[PDB]
Amino acid sequence: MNECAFGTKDPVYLNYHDHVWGQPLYDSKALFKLLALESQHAGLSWLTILKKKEAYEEAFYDFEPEKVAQMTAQDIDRLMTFPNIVHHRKKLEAIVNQAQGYLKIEQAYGSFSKFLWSYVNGKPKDLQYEHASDRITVDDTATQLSKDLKQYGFKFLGPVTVFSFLEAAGLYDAHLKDCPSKPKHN
Numbered sequence: 403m404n405e406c407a408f409g410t411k412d413p414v415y416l417n418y419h420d421h422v423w424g425q426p427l428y429d430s431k432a433l434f435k436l437l438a439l440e441s442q443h444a445g446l447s448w449l450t451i452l453k454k455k456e457a458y459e460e461a462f463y464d465f466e467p468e469k470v471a472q473m474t475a476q477d478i479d480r481l482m483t484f485p486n487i488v489h490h491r492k493k494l495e496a497i498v499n500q501a502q503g504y505l506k507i508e509q510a511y512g513s514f515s516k517f518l519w520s521y522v523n524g525k526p527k528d529l530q531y532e533h534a535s536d537r538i539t540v541d542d543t544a545t546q547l548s549k550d551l552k553q554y555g556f557k558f559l560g561p562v563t564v565f566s567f568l569e570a571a572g573l574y575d576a577h578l579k580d581c582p583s584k585p586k587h588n
């Protein structure tokens with residue numbers, strides 16, 4: 403559904419809308435990767451990051467948190483000229499701080515997935531949208547999660563960005579009622 407996919411026609415973006423965005427994601431490492439890539443979105447089109455995903459994977463150990471968490475200024479120095487990623491130093495540093503935060507969460511709570519999913523009581527919040535104009539960009543839960551993640555050292559993940567992540571990972575289902583890609587919830 404065109405309306406649901408923000409009126410974007412580029413089929414690389416539509417692929418993301420159709421096969422990733424809003425589909426419940428329960429795997430800890432996959433959640434981390436999606437969150438990390440979401441943090442790179444700011445001030446750019448999502449298509450920009452999508453086309454660079456494989457480059458980010460090569461830059462960041464396939465977003466494996468134990469490996470990313472150990473990266474240093476020395477790695478970031480190198481990555482500032484690594485081809486086909488966005489060379490915004492604070493964005494790149496943020497991915498490392500996020501990986502460190504993930505490890506701290508898993509130390510305290512066991513599972514990064516269980517930590518995040520707890521914010522919606524273990525099942526997707528169906529926002530029951532019918533029109534694209536129904537959509538909000540932030541809420542109280544995303545704001546609290548943003549704050550809570552900040553306490554474990556996560557960076558570049560403000561309330562609006564976290565809200566976007568919740569929708570992307572399917573913790574929130576923001577697909578329109580008549581979108582072919584709207585997931586079934588039981």
Ligand SMILES: [Zn+2]
Nearest residue numbers: 406577581583
């Ligand atoms: Zn949709």
